[PDB]
Amino acid sequence: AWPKVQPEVNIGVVGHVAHGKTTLVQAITGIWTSKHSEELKRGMTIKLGYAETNIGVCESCKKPEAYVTEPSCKSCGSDDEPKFLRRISFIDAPGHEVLMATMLSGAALMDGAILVVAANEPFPQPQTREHFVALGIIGVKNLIIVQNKVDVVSKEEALSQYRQIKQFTKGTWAENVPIIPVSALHKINIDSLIEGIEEYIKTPYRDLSQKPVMLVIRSFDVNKPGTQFNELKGGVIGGSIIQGLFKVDQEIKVLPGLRVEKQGKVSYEPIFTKISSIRFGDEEFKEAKPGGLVAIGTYLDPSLTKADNLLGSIITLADAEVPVLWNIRIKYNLLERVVGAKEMLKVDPIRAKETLMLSVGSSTTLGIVTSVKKDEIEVELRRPVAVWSNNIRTVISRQIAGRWRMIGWGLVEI
Ligand SMILES: Nc1nc2c(ncn2[C@@H]2O[C@H](COP(=O)(O)OP(=O)(O)OP(=O)(O)O)[C@@H](O)[C@H]2O)c(=O)[nH]1
Ligand SMILES: Nc1nc2c(ncn2[C@@H]2O[C@H](COP(=O)(O)OP(=O)(O)O)[C@@H](O)[C@H]2O)c(=O)[nH]1
Ligand SMILES: [Mg+2]
């Protein structure tokens, strides 16, 4: 048998709308990540999708078919049990141009990524470009490019596109990244991709002694109809542990916390609670480390967590000191052009009084520019952000032609 362990690595899946991200994750894991009504009706990803799988290798078989996602080697002709390698998970991003902020919140959780490129569409499409640039900015450099939908193009067309992809990465940080051709729909060459994931998206080093920090991307009321009462539960908070570890019965706090009134003004009150349970997928654990998206059970009133109310928050230990800032100073750089537009325009300099969109960790916040200097801006935010370390990456977006567009990035200076 294989052990039951949490995923140890997060692999982002990014790329232009409908190029096959969610179908690729299904091909690898058997899971369709879309769970929301509007996602199922529109046939598109809207919220961040998630799925897990074990990975193993049949030591008596040849690669790539030796790589498997279940404890069997029957498919490559061996009665031996495959050797367990690791459990992995996928952060399945929306590709739609209006949902770039959601992709960015997911990229803060990624240990590596797969950029999916449809073989039957012109290259490079706007969000092929935009997600590629975003990965570079955020520093997700452990990248595999997957050429999907090769089932509906000729060998000649696929090779032509392959050469344009290599030329696109030429002279960039991604110059050496592998391109793996597959069909997600018909599950062709998926074993080569799994081998690729093992070779190019290794589990990163973690620091388990750093102050525990979880970036929140989901929060739920897990109580369903037709249940007794001795099986009802407090609110659940879901996200990615980016450093340290958490344990059942630990006293924790949610930051910035709850929007409340205090002394005639709007305030954020840190939410203190205790960890009641820890789950990854369908399995319970006594502790949680980086890797995977964890569900943290709490003793909170489920009305506090219902419907992703805490999205963008962080969780730390109760006694941790974490800055919560209404005003932030950013050492910034601007992109040369608006890469996500169908027509790439030049990026205008930042001006005082502009309303910008800031991506910080899993949070997305609007703010007004109160100060512009050559490489430093100061922003008055509409909501405070939790800033758990010095020099956290932020991505800057501006509304251009009715759309939020990524235009730059920087470090939040504390
Ligand atoms: N022929 C062919 N069609 C595919 C393949 N992979 C995905 N598709 C089809 O492409 C369409 C979009 O697939 P999705 O997996 O939903 O693409 P997506 O990238 O997740 O789309 P968004 O999340 O909305 O940005 C669906 O109709 C799929 O069945 C493939 O390998 N070959
Ligand atoms: N820690 C913890 N997590 C839970 C518990 N029950 C459910 N979860 C997790 O919370 C998430 C939401 O649960 P689910 O029943 O699917 O709620 P739904 O998505 O609204 O239908 C899932 O990913 C579960 O793994 C629990 O008792 N403790
Ligand atoms: Mg999708």
Residue numbers in the entry: 2 to 415
Q: What's in the article?
A:
In eukaryotic and archaeal cells, the initiator tRNA carrier is the e/aIF2 heterotrimer. In its GTP-bound form, this factor specifically binds Met-tRNAiMet and brings it to the initiation complex. The γ subunit forms the core of the heterotrimer and contains the GTP-binding pocket. α and β are bound to γ but do not interact together. We were able to observe GTP hydrolysis by aIF2 or by its isolated γ subunit.
